[PDB]
Design a protein around this ligand. Structure first.
Ligand SMILES: Cc1cc2nc3c(=O)[nH]c(=O)nc-3n(C[C@H](O)[C@H](O)[C@H](O)COP(=O)(O)OP(=O)(O)OC[C@H]3O[C@@H](n4cnc5c(N)ncnc54)[C@H](O)[C@@H]3O)c2cc1CS
Ligand SMILES: Cc1cc2nc3c(=O)[nH]c(=O)nc-3n(C[C@H](O)[C@H](O)[C@H](O)COP(=O)(O)OP(=O)(O)OC[C@H]3O[C@@H](n4cnc5c(N)ncnc54)[C@H](O)[C@@H]3O)c2cc1CS
Ligand SMILES: Cc1cc2nc3c(=O)[nH]c(=O)nc-3n(C[C@H](O)[C@H](O)[C@H](O)COP(=O)(O)OP(=O)(O)OC[C@H]3O[C@@H](n4cnc5c(N)ncnc54)[C@H](O)[C@@H]3O)c2cc1CS
Ligand SMILES: CCCCCCCCCCCCO[C@@H]1O[C@H](CO)[C@@H](O[C@H]2O[C@H](CO)[C@@H](O)[C@H](O)[C@H]2O)[C@H](O)[C@H]1O
Ligand SMILES: CCCCCCCCCCCCO[C@@H]1O[C@H](CO)[C@@H](O[C@H]2O[C@H](CO)[C@@H](O)[C@H](O)[C@H]2O)[C@H](O)[C@H]1O
Ligand SMILES: CCCCCCCCCCCCO[C@@H]1O[C@H](CO)[C@@H](O[C@H]2O[C@H](CO)[C@@H](O)[C@H](O)[C@H]2O)[C@H](O)[C@H]1O
Lengths: 429, 429, 429
């Protein structure tokens, strides 16, 4: 039987591994990850707020994967030799492969001066639990809060989420009137999201921030985060400072060193992310595939302050479907190749209500969008959390009824037959 | 009996002639037009989209007009000698008049370099049909679309209609995701219309364009249209390019050579349109009147990129009522004279829904506005098309019941008794 | 028997005296005011429009105050001696105090050239009644109207009310299509109000002005008001003019000479307003307190054209409660001290409909806001008019049920226990 190695035990890796296992019972699958657990990333802001226990939004992998006949190597992957078809781990183990799926997620860059030491973040479970400790210090003696995104950021949604959630928590403890709140972004306007807006999302986010007294500055570059202030710069080259006792900023993403260790035909020279085509396949090494945030996708828009394109859960699940069909078809000498649609349903949780965004596809021109807001969306978010964690524990990330439901309600088709893969990911075949 | 000559068989000419015939059965009336049909201009964008047949939106004049005792001459009117009270047609035929109504409509100016050769337009039935043929090539080989208005345009609505109708068509064909759309206009902002806006039209159109993925650039001057790009200049004097496979631009308007031949007391030197007062009568030759787009009306505001005032269907019908009454009162020695109210009910059809704009009067200060959008407004537009074509065929463009219904629903009165005609058209007596 | 003197028979003065009386029946209380009446300021725009009679919105104080054991002296206070605990009136009466409350309202500055002589205002009942006279001149001979605020203004609401009420009047008279209207403000944008906005107030007023054809110019400095034009200067320092037969502008505010007569420890050396701390107490003379418009509160933000913070009715009522309690506790050897919450409910009346604005606190960061518009709000303003006048005539500006009702509907509490008064008014202890 053939052998697939998957690097990374997160959303993209588990989904590709499970898709492969369900398509092909006797295929060999080995997953390598530095963390012994799968963590449900959409719940990290909630964890930082103290609204979750770590144990409730994570799944230990060692006792779980052998039930679905998948081998788990709890180690970090160190280098890739693509001519030799090998991955080497931190202890020195060499695993040979027929196909490689790289799904290592973000490598975080705290690009602002003093960001790593003076600020907080919520991108990992470990960073989130440390943010929670800083919040208890805030509640005890309130002060100015500033949240947002530095230049180069491509994941803007959790910043908006955390701000609105923190507003809600401060308000429930009756202390919001003692805490200034300011939001600062590299986005040219609020609700850009690195996608050029989704419908009238600019008007909607502006209205929401006004109603909930969150001040904002957009189309600027955050340059320094000090223990007592945040410094940013505008398009004229003028510098400005804003007071701050507690901060939470999004880092920007680059590719990891394990990817860089491969050629310049695999690691993008500008950012170290995986070079992929429409079919999420490396153009030069055809048995290497990219899934998730680690993939190199061109910006939708060249903004005055540089921003990038998000890779959301629904996009990543479509990547995982396409890639898994592409590997299985290659094994069987079926010439049909699939591109993911790259549409997205995103919910931004605000506390007891939430924003609902749908874009089809995410990269314009679009066939359609939906932008709505209500309490119903918050309960749908909590419900999807419980469903997705069930899916991880039961060994199927893509049950048939789910695709049918998204087709009934939203006219979504997750993957398309692609006649020519050669082009940037997101371009149409 | 007395003799009135009407030049032009369109909205303004038919309405004045019919108004005159019903006011005075004994009056001799001659209508001169270069086209053998009346064409319903508001259905031209729909003709361009292939949603109408020409025969369904036009009425032949020669077998019809004699039934209402109106003499039809199917020739171009070539010159006017206002001192001899004579009109001279292209074949040399000389027709003496007691009163003259000029209603020749717009003379089209394709002012951007290469516009007439490389672009399309929808202002005449013949141009609309040419546009339909070019759209066929766009559906077969999809590319970037740019639509809009060059400098000096005074009719913006049909450009907004066309853009939204095309978006609808592309979605019904399931190929909108393959076609970038950009809107480029001389207006200082979207929803200006050459009237400084109608209520919150700017916010309405901005939200509509964002919801339906129509990109836009306002407050610029389109300089050139090539086979492959559109070239515009900004207010800093810097030039830009946008890629373009299919384009549709509005031309600007001037007046005709028949008006120019009457001298500078009748022809406005700056634009060749008919010099008229408040009563739509010529100041120096008082047996000459102007009705419709050919009348010289000042812009409502001086915009950074030059723009002019629309003459809409409701405004022109009001011009026709006022003019017919003024002539008939002269014959009878009744010193009463009338100015049109110049209010407008406009519907921009977007395919399956539409925007409804009401302004009373169009030229500020206004008494009231209404700006709405829904499915209902689309069905009203179709309904009115049928109604207006019926009126042309049945010899009465102003049935009494219509004025009464407009009074009880929107509080409009079509004409006002004017104490002093001596002033610009649109200014208050 | 302890003795407190109150200067000013307005909102702040009446409210502080009544609070003190109800807290301590055996306290000696003297109120000094130059006007013999209480004037319900919120109905001055209505008075200027001719929609009220002066007698319906005022309360003579001489026969009223004795009823609640309050000594009334109808004289202007001219000097204060803080070291001697004395107040000197215009005649020459020296009044000794144990505690002093300064509440003399706004002292008006007509900063624009020709403003006092050529424009109109509505800040006093005298000015309001004179404005009504000029409005009759306008109806007789229609012409261009301009309304707004000059640099330094801190009270913007009444100018917005007046513009819309006047539009409404003209509409009922059927002459609005003959009257251009322009609103010119020192605010950086419409709906700033000197508070940095209340929810989406900017969007609301912008749409309102569009629907009702009121033109506007923001972020500029009105320099001159002439009999036929209004002159302003923009941020680039360029001069402009606008035609005008009728105008109404807000003047800016400073402190009175009676405050200046005390030390530069009492009078703010920039604007002459009363120097207070968080508990609305003077830092150096601890038996001196300030209430209402006369208190010196820093601007919420420094705007391009200078602008200041309003003191609305509800804000002033809470200042009065805190000050009354702070005096009583000092007498009773109770160390506890109180700061006002400074929340506000403001209704801007437009004629037949109105805008409802709620901000808690007015000075940010805020716990919550509400912005609404409808017919109900107009009837609400009329209802509060009747209710407040009743309270003045009945000796209790703070009946216990009102607090409970504000609590159950808006979650408002009027005052807070303050562990440290030492800081700027409106800052958090
Ligand atoms: C904070 C946060 C919130 C968040 N919320 C989202 C949401 O509400 N909806 C939504 O659609 N998307 C949200 N996203 C984005 C996205 O869904 C997440 O970023 C995903 O987690 C990304 O999926 P990936 O598979 O790309 O990354 P991963 O982090 O889940 O997993 C990577 C795994 O790889 C391991 N690893 C790293 N390096 C390794 C090496 N060298 N060797 C072996 N293994 C390696 C790593 O441990 C992990 O298991 C949201 C996104 C965010 C984040 S800022
Ligand atoms: C494309 C387009 C759409 C459009 N839609 C409108 C709408 O939805 N509502 C509305 O209220 N108005 C709309 N208008 C504008 C306006 O109503 C039309 O332009 C009217 O047709 C203008 O009426 P006129 O009477 O001014 O002109 P006409 O074109 O109808 O007819 C003039 C006649 O005169 C003839 N003629 C020209 N030169 C002659 C000489 N030398 N001798 C004799 N006769 C001559 C000509 O053939 C014609 O019969 C909309 C407007 C548009 C347009 S871009
Ligand atoms: C035109 C206008 C409308 C207006 N509308 C308001 C509204 O709808 N809601 C709201 O909440 N607030 C509104 N305000 C603001 C505010 O509530 C008013 O300005 C109050 O009237 C202010 O209260 P104050 O106590 O600060 O001032 P006052 O004018 O009521 O009373 C001052 C009294 O003192 C007398 N006086 C002056 N100088 C004296 C000396 N030297 N010695 C003795 N007495 C002196 C004076 O005669 C008066 O009795 C609105 C505000 C406006 C106005 S621009
Ligand atoms: C496992 C697969 C999951 C598939 C999920 C499919 C997603 C499709 C949902 C998007 C469609 C729009 O979603 C729908 O929008 C309307 C608004 O028009 C929402 O809102 C409506 O319901 C709530 C009920 O409390 C009302 O208060 C609200 O006034 C009303 O407008 C619906 O509650 C929501 O369900
Ligand atoms: C020849 C004579 C010409 C007659 C003149 C015609 C007068 C024009 C009247 C326009 C006034 C607005 O017209 C009216 O607006 C309301 C909006 O509140 C619309 O109401 C619409 O919006 C609501 C929004 O909740 C929808 O749920 C509803 O299905 C829809 O009907 C009416 O469908 C429309 O008829
Ligand atoms: C004794 C002191 C007085 C205590 C102060 C009372 C607190 C006031 C609370 C106001 C905040 C709630 O604001 C509430 O919003 C809704 C939403 O449109 C308003 O409007 C609603 O009622 C009106 C009543 O005719 C309807 O015409 C309208 O269509 C409906 O929407 C309510 O009239 C208003 O009461």
């Amino acid at each position: 039987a053939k052998h697939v190695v998957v690097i990374g035990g997160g959303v993209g890796g588990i989904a590709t591994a499970y898709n492969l296992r369900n398509l092909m019972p006797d295929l060999k699958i080995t997953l390598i990850s530095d963390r012994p657990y799968f963590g449900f990333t959409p719940a990290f802001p909630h964890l930082a707020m103290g609204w979750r226990k770590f144990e409730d939004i994570s799944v230990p992998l060692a006792p779980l994967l052998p039930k679905f006949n998948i081998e788990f190597i709890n180690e970090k992957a160190e280098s890739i030799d693509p001519d030799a078809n090998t991955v080497t781990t931190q202890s020195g183990k060499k695993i040979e492969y027929d196909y490689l799926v790289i799904a290592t997620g973000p490598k975080l860059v705290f690009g602002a001066e003093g960001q790593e030491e003076n600020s907080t973040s919520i991108c990992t479970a470990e960073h989130a639990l440390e943010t929670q400790k800083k919040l208890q210090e805030l509640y005890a003696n309130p002060g100015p809060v500033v949240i947002g995104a530095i230049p180069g950021v491509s994941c803007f949604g959790p910043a908006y989420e955390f701000a609105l959630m923190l507003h809600y928590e401060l308000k429930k403890r009756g202390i919001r009137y003692k805490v200034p709140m300011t939001f600062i972004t590299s986005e040219p306007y609020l609700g850009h999201f690195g996608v050029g807006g989704i419908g009238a999302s600019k008007r909607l986010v502006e209205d929401l921030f006004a109603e909930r007294n969150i001040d904002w500055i957009a189309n600027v570059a955050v340059k320094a985060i000090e223990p007592d202030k945040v410094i940013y710069e505008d398009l004229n080259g003028n510098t400005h400072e804003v007071p701050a006792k507690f901060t939470m900023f999004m880092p920007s993403f680059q590719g990891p060193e394990v990817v860089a260790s491969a050629g310049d035909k695999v690691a993008n020279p500008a950012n170290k992310m995986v070079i992929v085509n429409r079919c999420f396949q490396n153009p030069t090494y055809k048995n290497i595939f990219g899934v998730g945030v680690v993939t190199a996708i061109p910006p939708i828009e060249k903004t005055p302050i540089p921003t990038g394109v998000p890779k959301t859960g629904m996009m990543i699940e479509q990547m995982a479907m396409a890639v898994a069909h592409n590997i299985v078809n290659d094994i069987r000498n079926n010439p049909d190749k699939y591109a993911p649609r790259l549409s997205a349903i995103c919910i931004a949780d605000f506390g007891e209500d939430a924003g609902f965004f749908f874009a089809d596809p995410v990269i314009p021109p679009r066939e359609r969008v939906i932008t709505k807001m209500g309490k119903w969306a918050h309960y749908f978010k909590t419900a999807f959390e419980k469903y997705f964690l069930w899916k991880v524990r039961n060994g199927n990330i893509a049950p048939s009824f789910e695709e049918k439901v998204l087709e009934i309600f939203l006219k979504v088709h997750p993957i398309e037959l692609c006649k020519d893969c050669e082009g940037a990911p997101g371009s149409r075949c």
